[model samples]
Target: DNVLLSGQTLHADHSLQAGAYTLTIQNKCNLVKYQNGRQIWASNTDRRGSGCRLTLLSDGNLVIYDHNNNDVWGSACWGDNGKYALVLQKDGRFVIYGPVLWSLGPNGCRR
Candidate 1:
């Protein structure tokens, strides 16, 4: 499995293959998962825009962004911290987890 921190991204032509799953940012801009070369899941936002990228944002949302930085699609999973990260599990699951929002800062809550 690979851990992707906030702001990390996989561009349209990229992919990551863990133990049993292959997660890819399809050429058409859709994100898809494959197991044993068989399709398992898809983000279904293909051809929605150009110069797209899939990002794991700090809020734990997995988003596909267009050339203009528009959010064309996303995983819709929100978390407390801007410290969150995304992981493609070897067991065939995509997940986001992170430390508390306060823990990411230098002084916890010194605003």
Candidate 2:
């Protein structure tokens, strides 16, 4: 149930959660991943803008935009192989599937 389809948006304070991992778009314009409430990966786009949103564009780019609609962070990943879906896996990894143009993978995964 944790999926962000193309053209979908994740507003500030909103999160995509599955299992022990949570990827949230912070009100301070930062996109971060947490595991068991511990800090993990982050976009580090903080203080650049407020009321930011995470958007998975149709063209295969996942971007974080500020309140003024300025692009803060973006994954310029276009998988010419197929369509894409932003999926946060239960194993605590988030992948831009459909050919996996982007992924935040690390050690350890539980089935």
Candidate 3:
């Protein structure tokens, strides 16, 4: 269960790991996904903010808060049910799993 729970923080350089997938909150402030060490996807918030942290808010909002305490990016997906966990799926997808409240693009790669 490589997961990020509600209200939890994922600081830069941190990561969650599942079978063949790794989801990282990179230093540049982008949340990136890699499969077997190969870059697969990213949040595309890189260098847009500094000292950013990935957070799963209580409302199930996936957001990137920066040093300025601003929301640099967010998933903007409100769960059909409620706040849940951000999961690193074995298929190399980054997903918020409140009955799939949100996920990356089809192949799980977006930018």
Candidate 4:
């Protein structure tokens, strides 16, 4: 399959490189999805260009949200305890490894 490189496309292998990612928020929009390789929930949060927030926790969790602070997307999709370990798989997937459980990102989110 031929993968097209674009601003809002997901790469086959799912590996997003180092770059400046931007998220726009709108009044009628508040969703998130992967826009490019290895990046999930990369799209959304903007229907008319308002504003959004992206935060990376110390445990390696990445979260995007609106001004209300509600999670639009993040590593907590699998589970929330703030005790598990975060890991971004070689395949470019984010995961939280707990005592006996492993949570995945949007592509393959697990807990």
Top TM-score prediction, candidate number: 2
- Residue 108, candidate 3: Cα error in Å is 33
Who is ahead in TM-score, 2 or 3? 2
lDDT of 2 at 38: 88
The estimated TM-scores of all candidates read: 0.80, 0.81, 0.79, 0.32
Q: What is the C-alpha lDDT of each candidate?
A: 0.79, 0.83, 0.81, 0.38
Lowest-sum lDDT 10-residue window in model 3: 102-111
The digit string of per-residue lDDT tens for model 2 on 4-87 reads 988789999999999999999998988899999988899898888999999887666789999899988888677554346899
Candidate 3, residues 69-102: lDDT per residue as tens digits? 8888899877544457888877767778664435
Which is the winner by lDDT between candidate 1 and candidate 4? 1
Ranking by TM-score: 2, 1, 3, 4
* Residue-by-residue lDDT tens digits, candidate 1, 2-105: 66678888887787778879988875678889998888898888888888888887777888888788888987778665677678889988777764436555
Candidate 2 similarity to native, TM-score = 0.81
Among all windows of 10 consecutive residues in model 2, the one with the lowest summed lDDT is 102-111
Q: Model 3 compared with the native: what TM-score?
A: 0.79
Give RMSD to native, each candidate.
Answer: 3.4, 8.6, 9.1, 12.0
lDDT of 2 at 102: 43
